[PDB]
């Protein structure tokens, strides 16, 4: 029943966990608790096999642990700044080489998989700070420049015409802008990691920078110069939709250093670089 299917989504009971059955004392030469970790397989022993359990009807569900749920929350991926200090023409526009590597929180989550395929929902939170008092009428333009398209070099560059590129215009006082993007790779999935180069010489680049070119995000204050200077900070949020992930991996254990690389720093006292807390000894809980 596609309606029975719907009731489960509303209650979040699509993926139920198994019940615990009653077990009894045993005496046999079948020893489930014994095994060999050398095989590379996890012992599949359950509680009913080691202790005498009662019958319990499980109600827990795994819905929230699904990949869709784990990566399906908007997180910040960039904070764009347009600060008018002394030259409107030079300070009223900027650009950003798109990527999901600059903010640790969402980067770590996606990097718990080797490959991932998903659509994206971008939400923008612009905030205009009045440095001199008034803010006037702020209108912003965010333009997606795919690799190859002309990048604007002045606030009146012809590229802002956006004859083919996608642009979103936002007016101060209106709701936060938002839009969807389909899976963009030229491959079947995005590479969270890439053990490869863009050539075979000592000067070839290594890593995801080779495969994850997403283009540039160009933005500008559409409004022309005003008497009072403002500082506009636009925060970009990303969320994955219709997600699929492959080959899970160990979580990032040390701070990130740069984008597109697994490089890290290490101090003289390494225990400070990882989340592991020193134990007094083996028996001090």
């Amino acid at each position: 029943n596609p309606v029975e299917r719907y009731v489960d989504e509303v209650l979040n009971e699509v993926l139920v966990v198994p019940n615990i059955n009653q077990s009894h004392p045993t005496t046999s030469n079948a020893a489930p608790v014994l095994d060999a970790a050398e095989t590379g397989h996890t012992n599949k022993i359950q509680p009913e096999d080691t202790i005498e359990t009662r019958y319990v009807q499980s109600s827990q569900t795994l819905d929230e642990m699904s990949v869709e749920s784990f990566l399906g929350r908007s997180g910040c991926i960039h904070e764009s700044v347009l600060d008018i200090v002394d030259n409107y023409n030079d300070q009223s526009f900027t650009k950003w080489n798109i990527n999901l590597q600059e903010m640790a929180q969402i980067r770590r989550k996606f990097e718990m998989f080797t490959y991932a395929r998903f659509d994206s929902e971008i939400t923008m939170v612009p905030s205009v700070a009045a440095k001199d008092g008034h803010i006037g009428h702020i209108v912003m333009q965010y333009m997606y420049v795919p690799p190859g398209a002309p990048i604007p070099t002045t606030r009146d560059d012809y590229a802002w015409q956006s004859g083919t590129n996608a642009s979103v215009f936002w007016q101060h006082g209106q709701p936060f802008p938002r839009f969807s993007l389909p899976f963009l790779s030229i491959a079947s999935a995005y590479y969270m990691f890439y053990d490869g180069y863009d050539g075979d010489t000592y000067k070839s680049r290594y890593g995801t920078v080779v495969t994850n070119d997403m283009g540039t995000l160009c933005s500008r204050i559409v409004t022309s110069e005003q008497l009072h200077k403002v500082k506009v900070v636009t925060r970009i949020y990303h969320k994955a939709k219709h997600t699929k992930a492959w080959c899970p991996r160990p979580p990032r254990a040390v701070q990130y250093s740069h984008t597109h690389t697994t490089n890290y720093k290490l101090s003289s006292e390494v225990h400070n670089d990882v989340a592991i807390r020193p134990r007094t000894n083996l028996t001090t809980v």
Binding site: T39, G40, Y191, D195, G196, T201, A253, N263, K265
Partner: protein, 252 residues
């Protein structure tokens, strides 16, 4: 007997009388590329038994101070018979593998090796800013890399085994296809991995799909240390196919 194994590939056969079962990476057996997933349009070349055979790399010596070893595939086989020739004459290649790690000692020796196959093992550099591992360092060939030895040049990758040479904790490597060689139980490990990538075929020269990492988690000990205990790796490609033939690429 569940602790015996015979693996036949092409004209090669490998045996072990003390195994700990075998592992099939992600439960998927290697297979040829299908027309629904394929993208390159020319007919692939499939060397069959002349390439899908066991190739034995250089042996390594395991001692009480060893920190580990790693190899990258297909790089480790770049100079191995027909398989090697094919990866340089073609732009694209695709293949699965049967990795068989060998190491025997005695019932009076103890030690444990963690044998892991990592997909897209992108190495890190330490305290060097945004400078990444250089091409020649991640393409050691059959000699692989012996952790804790190299002469520190700038593009030299991380040599921290406890951080997986990539910023993650060693104890969690078990999330990847793996096995252990616990001297008191087995003297070999066998991993069969399929082709894993976001594209159906790729450059055998600029991209290493898998990385074989061997870390001794339990120090090798015995009361007869003068007796050298080697570690030998034998790898056999499976369903190897190549596309985009041309002149032979010469590297470095």
């Amino acid at each position: 007997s569940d602790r015996i194994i015979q693996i036949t590939r092409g004209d090669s056969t490998i045996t072990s009388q003390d195994v700990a079962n075998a592992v099939v990476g992600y439960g998927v057996w290697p297979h040829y590329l299908t027309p629904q997933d394929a993208t390159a349009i020319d007919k692939p070349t499939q060397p069959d038994t002349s390439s899908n055979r066991f190739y034995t790399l250089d042996s390594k010596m395991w001692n009480s101070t060893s920190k580990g070893w790693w190899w990258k595939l297909p790089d480790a086989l770049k100079d191995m018979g027909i398989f090697g020739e094919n990866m340089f004459y073609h732009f694209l290649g695709r293949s699965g593998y049967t990795v068989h790690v060998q190491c025997n000692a005695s019932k009076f020796h103890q030690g444990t090796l963690l044998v892991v196959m990592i997909p897209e093992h992108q190495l890190a550099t330490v305290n060097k800013g945004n400078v990444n591992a250089g091409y020649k360092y991640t393409h050691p060939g059959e000699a692989g890399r012996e952790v804790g030895t190299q002469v520190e040049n700038e593009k030299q990758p991380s040599d921290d085994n406890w951080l997986n040479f990539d910023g993650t904790l060693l104890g969690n490597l078990l999330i990847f296809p793996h096995q252990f060689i616990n001297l008191r139980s087995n003297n070999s490990a066998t991993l069969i991995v399929p082709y894993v990538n976001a594209v159906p075929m790729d450059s055998m020269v600029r991209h290493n799909n898998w990385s074989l990492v061997i870390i001794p988690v339990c120090q090798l000990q015995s009361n007869n240390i003068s007796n050298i205990v080697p570690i030998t790796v034998s790898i056999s490609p499976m369903c190897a196919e190549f596309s985009g033939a041309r002149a032979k690429t010469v590297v470095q």
